[PDB]
Amino acid sequence: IVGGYTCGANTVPYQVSLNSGYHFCGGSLINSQWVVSAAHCYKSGIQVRLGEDNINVVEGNEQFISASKSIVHPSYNSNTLNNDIMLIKLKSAASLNSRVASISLPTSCASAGTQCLISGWGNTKSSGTSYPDVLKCLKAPILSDSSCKSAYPGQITSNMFCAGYLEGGKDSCQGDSGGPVVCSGKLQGIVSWGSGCAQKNKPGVYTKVCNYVSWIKQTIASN
Ligand SMILES: [Ca+2]
Known part of the structure; x- marks a missing residue:
C-alpha cells in the first residue's frame, strides 16, 4: 500500500x-x-x-x-x-x-464513484522497496470504465475494474496482490495488477468479484 x-x-x-x-x-x-x-x-x-x-x-x-x-x-x-x-x-x-x-460477497456490482477500503502488507514505495510490519490501509474510489480503459487501452476485460487516483501517490503494490477491495461491507475486488505503483494515469486494476x-x-x- x-x-x-x-x-x-x-x-x-x-x-x-x-x-x-x-x-x-x-x-x-x-x-x-x-x-x-x-x-x-x-x-x-x-x-x-x-x-x-x-x-x-x-x-x-x-x-x-x-x-x-x-x-x-x-x-x-x-x-x-x-x-x-x-x-x-x-x-x-x-x-x-x-x-x-x-467478509460478505456482493449481491450486485458496485457503481463508479463508490469508496472502497484496500489493504495489505505490500510495498509502501512508488520507486524503492520498503515492506511494512503492520497492515496498511487505503481508501480509494472505483473509477469509471471509460477512464480505466483509457489508462490501459485493450488490456481491460469485463472481469476487471480500476480503482485509485489518477494524480498518483496512492495505490496498492507488490505484496498486496490477492488482497480485498471492500466497498459498503462487500468484497468487490481483488488486488490484481497495474503498471508500477502510485504512478499518475496508471491506476490499480482489480478482479471484478461480482x-x-x-x-x-x-x-x-x-x-
Ligand atoms: Ca503476527
Whole structure:
C-alpha cells in the first residue's frame, strides 16, 4: 500500500496473509473454511495466517492454518491476468471472533464513484522497496470504465475494474496482490495488477468479484 495509513490491530478482520516462510500475497476470508485470493498468487505449500497485524511478531490472535487445496479459476490466463481469482480451502475451520471474521460477497456490482477500503502488507514505495510490519490501509474510489480503459487501452476485460487516483501517490503494490477491495461491507475486488505503483494515469486494476459470485458459490458447494 503506497500513500496509505496504518489500519490498526485487527480492524480488518477478514484480511489474511498467504505465507510460505514469508508473506507473499493477501487474501479475504469469506467463511470459516474458505479464502479468496488472486490466481497469480498460486503456489504449492501455502499457510494462511489469520488475525495478523505485525506479520513478523507473534502477538496474539493469530491463527496459522495450512491450505488443503487451492482452486485457480480454470480460465485464468497468466498473460492477460483475466479471471485472476483463486479459492483456497483451509485444512481446518477458522475460529471466528472479534479479530477474525469473514467478509460478505456482493449481491450486485458496485457503481463508479463508490469508496472502497484496500489493504495489505505490500510495498509502501512508488520507486524503492520498503515492506511494512503492520497492515496498511487505503481508501480509494472505483473509477469509471471509460477512464480505466483509457489508462490501459485493450488490456481491460469485463472481469476487471480500476480503482485509485489518477494524480498518483496512492495505490496498492507488490505484496498486496490477492488482497480485498471492500466497498459498503462487500468484497468487490481483488488486488490484481497495474503498471508500477502510485504512478499518475496508471491506476490499480482489480478482479471484478461480482462477476464470480455464482462460480464461487458453485465451486465451494462441490468441494
Ligand atoms: Ca503476527
